[PDB]
């Protein structure tokens, strides 16, 4: 056998790890399948995509087009359906009809071999008709055959009878394909909508207590859910909900010594009260948790638990499974680190003494929470545990429960971030919070919305308990407004950590990205009712952003994204599309000064001609404009962070 | 099993067609094997390349280094040896010693846990020693272990005993590798030197005749060989040597009707006198050819024959194998085309009726010429025959005779060009003749010397019977000189078509790349002796260029190539290296005006510091200069096309 087929079809994309890992999609998501297709000689080729479902049933006829002249790169859009493992194949073929037409169009006017040329056409169309399954379609082609063969008519009219729009349509639907040649199948993993699309809210249940019981329970913390659902969130992300160690417990503002009242850090998991399969006694019981999950469910909220594979020194594993830790010559275990950050309250896990035991126990723990309605896990710092460990774990869990979603909380180098997504992580944290200028946003989002989108789904948290960017520190509320608009409109998954709404932006010190009085080390009661009454929250903006997302399919996908040029460095503009839904966003990235600019839209990229005018509505205001080629905007911090417009149709 | 190993080693390169075709090299050629290598956590990794020969024997220890900070891309140079199919593997591992050293160097001076740190070192070095096969090497490591454990010495000196150059050398040669992880093997095809390196000369034997017999024979044309060898060429490329059809024979200057004297085009192969396995009667016999091949051999010249899989209408195949042609409804066979070029004197071959018969006959014909000492074929327009046909043919021929070299004469789109090389073509024609500005040469050669060098070996013909570039037409002799320097120094394979030496540059008409009175359609006798006497040939320059190439290993390879900036658009500068041989070239691409410039050398890329001065000799003149950071050149067309300097040691 030869590697190359009769009609070359090469380098089909997307491809992940040379075919050894699947490319990704979710139900209802469209993406481009592409290939290098060409043939020997000068005759024309055609190509098409055969997308097969998990039962092997092929999708509809999906012809490809050359993506740019002279490149031999061909593409077509496919749309994933039900969940499971799909496959895709590209078929390439000689297109004798396009070839014959091109030649006939020159030769008939120039009078060269006209009887021969026209009889050659007749024979192609006759072969075409043979394969057409409709009687009416077949009859149409055979009529053009007879007109092509009618030697009593002028050559120009015998030919014209074979170039009618009615024939065009039969051939476009059932074309004559020579020497059909197939690529080898490539795997596609299709997963549920929520893997790609959702709004996430993170908060600490323990902070939502009462005057008589400051440490919240699952029962008190459930009272906070209606407001989360009202802001249009879909996922609630909870930091670890397990007992918390006492040895080397950290105090307020990340101090080394806890006082007797100090609650400690939820990530310092485990005590004699229990480990990763237990509930912190001050949060209540497994039944209180079930209640919380149930109440979340009634409001359209799914729970994501933090899974942090690490231990306080009081975690049962320390004595029950010493081999799951790296011990130094004196028998002690070095606390975990992530330089320059030190984690004196925890031990990292070692994986090379008992990998089988760790995997078995990890999936046991996850299956336990899954039995209690948790179908999403936020995996803390997966880049400090082996890549293959996660590949094995995720494959074990998804093999019985493919709906489970894992989110990689890994802020690290690009190779590891990409690899984690490729080996199974449904979602990934990103460099979003460190992309704030227009150049940075434009470059980074072009990367995420391009080839990386075949294996990585990004979750744009505008802030996290560990990240209060200098942009929010110096920018105040107007910067909070900008970052929410950006996050919500540039990724189909975004989220915030409680307090973002209130523009909490006091750092631990200058040049730090830590919050002062960080919630990680203390109860942080917040007077939500007061903030709402006093209007010192951007909950309404957040609420509006999520409503717009729910009403505009373009914002529930990632790959279709285009940046339009403006004449001010502080003003960025982009559009996103999905069927007939087009959303156009203009943001002022200066949180401190009013900016005016001309936004010059790439009109063909919106499906419009250069001269056209198009009505839009700013969904932030209800205000309507008529925009085209070149549009004046004026964006005032405080009053207007951005325009978020839908194209009216 | 998991796709990813314990220590990630990903995307090993070179790779061709995702591993389904081999990457290429020749005996003695060095190239970079690279991979993405990293681990979980913050400890250091190492990596190395295991190159295995056709018998499976691994090459030497070949450690890799990270190629640029923060990228996790690692590389090392390997060198191919004997011919055949090799394999290469990248091994990645935890490097605990580098990790421990880095930490020990901070902790011992700062007094933190010193007994614990040093004992951890001792245990590593003990594990190191276990795997060392030399008694003397082992004894060295065990000494540093004992010095590390000696609690009566200061901490600084217990540590210093483990950082000696003598320990460094044992560990550099036999390091402690944790969790060794291997990539899957990738195939390497290693071929003979000539596939990559050689100077080629093309000429038409028939043009080298006598006053009494103007049509040359193999016996008269042999007289021309000593001069070809004297110019330092290694390969003689002959246009087709077979009988030439009479029906539709073309006349002079590509006219449609031959007169009775007209000789026709050698590519119009076949008559009643014979086909592709015959000799044109006016060239002599198979014995005369053997004589020519023998005489070429004695002079260090190998013969490359043109193989053009096409027929005159008088070729025997037309009646013996009608099914090897596509016939139209009236029984005629459309002449071959290559738009806008028409080939009225030939028929193209059709491959879908009897692919087996065509492959069987093609290898038969090639084996016939191979029996007569032809081990190189220049394959005419392979892009008009199926890609898989060549893949099969080349695999069949190289399976018995791996030394045979095929050269793809395909000026076409990039995809097909690359594919032809990937499926087996040892050498490729290129876009060289259409790259004449500095930007064009720089861009194109960066492409050829980079990733494409793992599957394509370029043959830089400065001209061909079909290509007289406008640059040569308008530039005159100075342009001929520039293009020879460029071709000879930028590719390890280059060539010229006879007449190039004489600066024949009269086009058929303005805006054509055809020669007037093209040798393809007529005998073209040339007064070589006169041109040599009158100094109106650049044969001496050519002769010098090939001597320089034979004396400078840097110019006998392709991948090591760097462009150095100059401050004039018309002056280009580059260097090439191979062991301690460094060649530095500066060319004035303006053939009409004198150009002066400052050449600012990237000194680290020469293995030198910025401040260093280095002696060079212009091998064109014998003249010696001292060059550094910044060097003044003055290049005068006619006198000086270029400097071609060697770095003096
Ligand atoms: C992911 O986990 C890290 C380390 O586990 C968390 O860091 C916090 O928790 C540790 C352990 O209790 C503290 O020592 C550290 O000071 C905290 O910031 C991150 O918050 C999680 F995202
Ligand atoms: C490769 O082959 C082509 C076409 O075979 C040659 O074109 C010449 O020969 C044909 C056939 O005799 C003529 O019709 C044409 O006018 C010629 O230029 C090229 O020279 C070869 F490189």
UniProtKB/Swiss-Prot annotation, chains A, B:
Residue ranges that the Swiss-Prot or TrEMBL entry lists as coiled coil: none
Catalytic activity, reaction form: alpha-maltose 1-phosphate + [(1->4)-alpha-D-glucosyl](n) = [(1->4)-alpha-D-glucosyl](n+2) + phosphate
Enzyme class: transferase
Positions annotated to bind alpha-maltose 1-phosphate: 250, 310, 345, 381, 520-521
Site feature Transition state stabilizer, where: 466
pH sensitivity of activity: Optimum pH is 7.0 with maltohexaose as acceptor substrate.
Temperature dependence as stated in the record: Optimum temperature is 30 degrees Celsius with maltohexaose as acceptor substrate.
BP GO annotations: alpha-glucan biosynthetic process; oligosaccharide catabolic process
Active-site residues, as the UniProt record annotates them: 380 (nucleophile), 409 (proton donor)
Description of activity control: Is competitively inhibited by alpha-, beta- and gamma-cyclodextrins (cyclic maltooligosaccharides), unlike GlgE from M.tuberculosis.
Keywords, in A-Z order: Carbohydrate metabolism, Glycosyltransferase, Transferase
SMART domains per UniProt: Aamy
SUPFAM superfamilies: (Trans)glycosidases, Glycosyl hydrolase domain
Domain of life: Bacteria
GO molecular function terms attached to this record: alpha-amylase activity; hexosyltransferase activity
InterPro entries linked to this entry: GlgE, GLGE_C, GlgE_dom_N/S, Glyco_hydro_13_cat_dom, Glyco_hydro_b, Glycoside_hydrolase_SF, Ig-like_fold
Enzyme Commission designation: 2.4.99.16
Pfam family, one: GLGE_C
Stated family: Belongs to the glycosyl hydrolase 13 family. GlgE subfamily.
Job of this protein: Maltosyltransferase that uses maltose 1-phosphate (M1P) as the sugar donor to elongate linear or branched alpha-(1->4)-glucans. Maltooligosaccharides with a degree of polymerization (DP) superior or equal to 4 are efficient acceptors, with DP6 being optimal in the GlgE-catalyzed polymerization with M1P. Is specific for the alpha-anomer of M1P as substrate, since the beta-anomer of M1P gives no activity. Alpha-D-glucose 1-phosphate cannot serve as a donor substrate, but alpha-maltosyl fluoride is an efficient donor in vitro.
Subunit structure: Homodimer.
Listed name of the protein: Alpha-1,4-glucan:maltose-1-phosphate maltosyltransferase 1
Organism name: Streptomyces coelicolor (strain ATCC BAA-471 / A3(2) / M145)
Lineage, highest ranks first: Bacteria, Bacillati, Actinomycetota, Actinomycetes, Kitasatosporales
